[PDB]
Here is the input.
Amino acid sequence: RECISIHVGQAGVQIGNACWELYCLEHGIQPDGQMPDSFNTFFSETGAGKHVPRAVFVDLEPTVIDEVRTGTYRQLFHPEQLITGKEDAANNYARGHYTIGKEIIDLVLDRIRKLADQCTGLQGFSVFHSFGGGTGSGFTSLLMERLSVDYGKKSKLEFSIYPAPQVSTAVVEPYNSILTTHTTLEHSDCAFMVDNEAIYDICRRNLDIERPTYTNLNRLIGQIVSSITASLRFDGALNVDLTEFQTNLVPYPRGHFPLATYAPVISAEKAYHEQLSVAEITNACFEPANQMVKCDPRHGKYMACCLLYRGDVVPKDVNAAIATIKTKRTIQFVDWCPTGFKVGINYEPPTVVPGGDLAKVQRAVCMLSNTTAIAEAWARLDHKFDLMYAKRAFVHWYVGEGMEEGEFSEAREDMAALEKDYEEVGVDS
Amino acid sequence: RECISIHVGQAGVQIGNACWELYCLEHGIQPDGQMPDSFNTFFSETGAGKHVPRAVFVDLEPTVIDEVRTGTYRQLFHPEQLITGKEDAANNYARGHYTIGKEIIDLVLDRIRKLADQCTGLQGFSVFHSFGGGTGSGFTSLLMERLSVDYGKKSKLEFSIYPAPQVSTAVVEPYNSILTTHTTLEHSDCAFMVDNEAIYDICRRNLDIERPTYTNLNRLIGQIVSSITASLRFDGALNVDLTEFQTNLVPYPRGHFPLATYAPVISAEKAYHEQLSVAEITNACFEPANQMVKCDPRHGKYMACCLLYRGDVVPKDVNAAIATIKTKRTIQFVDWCPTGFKVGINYEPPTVVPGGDLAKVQRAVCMLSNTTAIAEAWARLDHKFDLMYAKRAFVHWYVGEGMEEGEFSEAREDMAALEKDYEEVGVDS
Amino acid sequence: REIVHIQAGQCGNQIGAKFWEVISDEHGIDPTGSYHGDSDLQLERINVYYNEAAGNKYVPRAILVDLEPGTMDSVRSGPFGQIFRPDNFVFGQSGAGNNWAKGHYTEGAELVDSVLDVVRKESESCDCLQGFQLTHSLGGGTGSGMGTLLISKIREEYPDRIMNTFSVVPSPKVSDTVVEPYNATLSVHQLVENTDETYCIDNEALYDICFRTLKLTTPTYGDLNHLVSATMSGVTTCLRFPGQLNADLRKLAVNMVPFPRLHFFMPGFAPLTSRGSQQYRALTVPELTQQMFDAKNMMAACDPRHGRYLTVAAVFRGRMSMKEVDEQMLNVQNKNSSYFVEWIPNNVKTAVCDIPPRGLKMSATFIGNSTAIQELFKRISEQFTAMFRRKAFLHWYTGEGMDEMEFTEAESNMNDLVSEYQQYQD
Amino acid sequence: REIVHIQAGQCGNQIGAKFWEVISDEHGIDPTGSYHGDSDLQLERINVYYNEAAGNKYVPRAILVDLEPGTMDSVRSGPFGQIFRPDNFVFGQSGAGNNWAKGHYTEGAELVDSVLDVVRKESESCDCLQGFQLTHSLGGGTGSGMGTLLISKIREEYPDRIMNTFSVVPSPKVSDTVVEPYNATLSVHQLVENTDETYCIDNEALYDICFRTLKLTTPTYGDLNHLVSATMSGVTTCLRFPGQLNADLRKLAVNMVPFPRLHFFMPGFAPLTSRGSQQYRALTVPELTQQMFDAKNMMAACDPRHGRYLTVAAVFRGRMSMKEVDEQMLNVQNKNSSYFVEWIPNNVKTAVCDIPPRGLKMSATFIGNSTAIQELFKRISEQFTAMFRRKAFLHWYTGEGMDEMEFTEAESNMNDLVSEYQQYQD
Ligand SMILES: Nc1nc2c(ncn2[C@@H]2O[C@H](COP(=O)(O)OP(=O)(O)OP(=O)(O)O)[C@@H](O)[C@H]2O)c(=O)[nH]1
Ligand SMILES: Nc1nc2c(ncn2[C@@H]2O[C@H](COP(=O)(O)OP(=O)(O)OP(=O)(O)O)[C@@H](O)[C@H]2O)c(=O)[nH]1
Ligand SMILES: Nc1nc2c(ncn2[C@@H]2O[C@H](COP(=O)(O)OP(=O)(O)O)[C@@H](O)[C@H]2O)c(=O)[nH]1
Ligand SMILES: Nc1nc2c(ncn2[C@@H]2O[C@H](COP(=O)(O)OP(=O)(O)O)[C@@H](O)[C@H]2O)c(=O)[nH]1
Here is the structure.
């Protein structure tokens, strides 16, 4: 029934604090834990007054988890559930996975085994990491790694924030992301992806603001995510379990990575304008300028979409708005796939931050999907890697951290067959 | 049912703000969008309490569209629908059509495809441009151009303000107007024409005022236009659809250009005088000093007139007042045309600005028509062109803007057969 | 849109102080203060001449080029002198010798790179650049030579953005210098081939227009400058205001230059009445065209009545009837069909702003492209030959690394330039 | 994490006083006082440079190595001089002769054990050690020789913890000593083979950058030092602060050293504007990259424009958009594709702290690993040979128990080091 969550890496933690915020916000549970089953699949009714979170936090520098235990919400989690390794983060996979990251893992696991026990027939762990980091790429790599073995019998949906197409940060980023992909690939169930840059566009083009603090992108994913777990694990006219996803969403064992998209992104101050039609939002979903991912459907044929709706929506409206789409053709779906549209309908409309910059409509569409499109995104990220590896660039930083020419070269070959995979499962009939 | 409108060029925008004003004014919708189908063919009920316009605004200098988003009405349109190219206007076709104007077009179209979708079975786009301008001549040229292909299956009535017969402004004007005619000719359905100068006469002779601000001429067309769309798309005793026009108004594919005329133009302060008879106004329509066009029926045989009446009018009064005319002979109608009188009767009388200078009668006649007369107006405007082209005058200004000796010489030949066309379809039996 | 003024030489500089003295007030910008603007419209378009740094400090985006410290150190030590960011001052403490050659090949050529540097810092400021304003005198070193270089470089760096040039062509009657035609002929040469809009002003056409059209008895330089700066404000800045029919540098350019030479104009202001008395207010409009189109009142030396026009641009700026404007222009075009050239059906380019010169009700800048200015380059060109023939003060040029073929070049060029201009007077 | 500063020699020492003068204020630590910190964040990470004993006495964890009493007795008898625990002062009252050999083999070799002793007392302080900061000049005894030994020993004791080296490579134009290239070539040798991050500063690259980028007319040493210390604060200490994207010595190391030599960088500070006036605040960000990436403003002597880069690390520290940061860096990488080496798709290593330099709004330390520094070791290496050839002041070395093959060694080594660095410029 439930779904634990492990927010790994400063980022996965910032995004975590965010997604975690939106939560209580739409569940009437002040930062003090108290509100005045349903949603029990994400919150445990500990003591007789509060609602201790149902997740954990893993960063190797204290800085970021520290800030959580300062700002209201400080009261929300258990002093315990926020894991730290005073040591060093290191923007390098190796160190975070092998060398350092190792020391903590046990302890980390312990919670996802201590928190996994306390519950009642769970469904999986929503993992939150930032592909191109040290604690986010490496560590998790083995966290998800140690999970796929300790609970192979569950769902492993990892929600990632993969490398901005041109606006990356770390100098090595690809090293860290070609490595988190190959090690997690054979361990995840469904990997959701939200592109940091391609989200900015949305903040520039669909909300207008050249002042987007990280704290915003977080509010956004913090939204799209709320549409995944939160509301879905919440009763409705067309419920969709976590398993449901991976089933209706992955055509093949590769921990396939769909893309997250939201429909109503419109800025407060617009807040009064006449609302958008069920048809418009539906249509907005097929626009490559509103998908939290720089993977513009440049050719990538969709192969399965899970249209999660929430708010006031008439099933016919959908079983029509989608019909219209199924026949737009310029939206070309894979061949071997007749119908690939999982319509998920929830009741409770979205819930926008009291005064951030999100419109606040009475219905939204968080559609996610597997698109032969990422054939690109992976490509462009793989190429990166080579260029540097081709010269070993910052290689001495990993080797000296318990890695080898193996893990790199052999994780490169890995993704290679991910460029062929995402190519074969499509483009051909 | 509806008819979008694209006001292009500062002028087409000033006139736009005007025609757009008269609108709400006679529909009880304050500048705040709110009023306390019918007219839905020009206004979309965004929800909701408002009445977002049903048109767009295209200028390459911000100045003029800017002023709209300052003065009440600021609230009327959507922040979006007013397109601008911070760049440069340039009183030259070429630059506006080719070089610069190009960059914006896509975006422009997008709205007339985004606004064209939202509606319900539309009828066409009432285009507003100023023949002899940069953004008005050039740009549109390709806007209407890109329309005739994207919606060949509709009406393209472009409402133009063609070059004052002697009181032109731009030094090049003809270059810009022989070019907007040839490029739009093979794309428009019916091109309405209102002569800027010949309207002044009306302000001097039929209203008395040597103080006519542009803001007035605009109130005027702003009137004649209201008689076209507004009221017509509005129920009545003898409705006339947009298609109706082009059908009952163009004898031949040349995007034929009728002339706009209004009957009751009498100044407030006269406002009390005993009103004019159904016969007088009817007769006023056959006077070459009241037609918003310096094309005095110097010989031009009418070939089709669409007498749009509004207010308290008895069909017999018309089907008599017109009969009397049909037999005045000195009003000679074409040969091949037995009867060319489309009687359009509306109910609601006109609606004059609260305190401008328009009389405010309880009935009016906005008669428009195709007259072999323009054989002149075109002639006199073509000749202009030659004189300058004959010396290349400001040619280097276009060439250096992605044009050639072709487009000029080959658009001259174009109109040439417009001087023969408007000659052959008449003067002969 | 935008522009970046350029104060080449002392004159061009002295005038800078007056062009900015004005313009600022026509934009409510106190010395270092901000926008005190009596209105709210004198701000939505300022950018054209300033930059945002502090929030009360909109600094003029011009350049101050000069090889004579004392000058810029008089402009920077007086009134509005403390608004320009020091970075703007591109001085050349060298000997600002009065030689075109000394400020174009030997002395100025060095200080150039340290100028272009800034002209780029300002161009790459923000938004979109339109062109650069250039003030100077064609009768000196830092003016004709070094400023005429500044452009030859500018026009290689952005052959897209425009180049208005405000030149103080050597007044006839008396020359405020001796080699004048040398420094001049040499700079006009550079002009006819780089800038694409030049507004030639004559210190004595001004006096006249300032001592008889303004009963002003003691017309100090400050004045002349002031009058000039009045016109260059009507031109640019003005059109960067709203209007029933507004234009902008290009329109002005693309309506005024029939043939690529670049052609030079002759600016004329509208209400030019003496203070107290004269304040006749006869400014309905026929009074402004009456003004603008008369001989006297043309900042140029030559008289329009002495040669057709190719183009005219009445850039009015004050609420008026597009009818009484568009109309007047006509009669004017017919009462004087004689001189107004024919192969252009409508020579005149009517332009119409809205807001007028701060304290006035109605004005109208005049930018005439008449063939009359033939009779000026003639003048200049004459003075040259009469003295070139004897190589008069030529050693001050050559001795500065010049060429005997350089002077030949310019004269001819600029001399041919006279020729052409006649090709239309006929 | 942690680090333990090392003030080798006088210079390295003099600078200690400035590096600690600063850093402290950037951590609210008064002379012997405690944390007066205007904030609460300048404390959660101090440990990196101090130790807890009393409760108001956080003592800098550095080492003061020098064979000349007077020096440390000037640093200990002045301002912040009374904050170092006396145990820190590892003096050598011997004759601190200006010989690399006198402070590396004969005189310093003795005082070493009594140093390592402490460098261990400080390392085994607590928590986890990161690395050691090393300040000194490669143009003297206690600096190049004895300090270059201190490391060769450190790097044998903890080949795990890092080693940043701040060297004052012998300025070109005029050297502040005579054997300079002797004491230098010999120390660089030791560097290229022990420390793994070196930041080379030039007393004259500073003057320049301090007399023209700070209209400062009397740049005392204190200043130079002060400027330098400003950069080393942005580097270390800084990153030991929070940030959207923070790094730390290693990141800096593991992103900046493509090949094991150790490679030397060239630090550059961001807001480097003269006091009053200049306080332009043009620090939106394009202004900082404008700064940092120009030639002048590189504490090094050589000019980047004279050789590609391998890596760059803009360690910014002041609230900014991970977009306007990540973005700018790009254009920069494309406007200068020429010099930025290609076999590294993204040379630049963007780093971003949060809290800025106490009194400033936005800054950004620059740590460049350009191939340009080839043209410096060349210099040094040249000076050597030209004088080695004649064994100039060699008797002061040998006579101190040295070798004729020792000098050969170093030059070659460091000389080859020049070679290699070119292997990438191509
Ligand atoms: N959407 C979003 N992206 C973030 C956020 N914080 C960081 N990122 C992105 O995630 C990546 C940064 O990872 P880091 O913060 O360097 O590292 P980490 O993954 O936390 O782990 P370490 O390297 O060991 O510190 C970059 O691509 C950032 O653009 C955040 O709050 N929201
Ligand atoms: N009736 C009417 N005519 C106008 C109005 N504004 C301008 N005109 C006329 O339209 C022409 C002017 O076009 P411009 O304003 O120069 O140019 P534009 O068409 O807006 O486009 P650009 O040249 O690129 O600026 C002239 O013939 C004017 O007389 C107006 O508000 N009403
Ligand atoms: N209108 C006007 N002319 C000036 C001013 N100053 C010098 N002039 C004219 O400029 C010419 C002299 O050139 P000058 O400016 O001294 O050259 P430069 O300073 O060496 O570049 C003479 O014809 C003067 O009448 C001024 O402030 N206003
Ligand atoms: N920046 C800087 N350089 C210094 C200082 N003191 C000496 N130097 C430089 O160091 C070199 C001399 O070495 P020195 O420090 O006297 O050697 P030592 O004292 O025998 O180890 C010269 O190049 C000086 O410019 C200082 O306080 N700041």
User: Anything to note?
Assistant: Residues 2-256 of chain D form a domain with the Rossmann fold fold (CATH 3.40.50.1440).
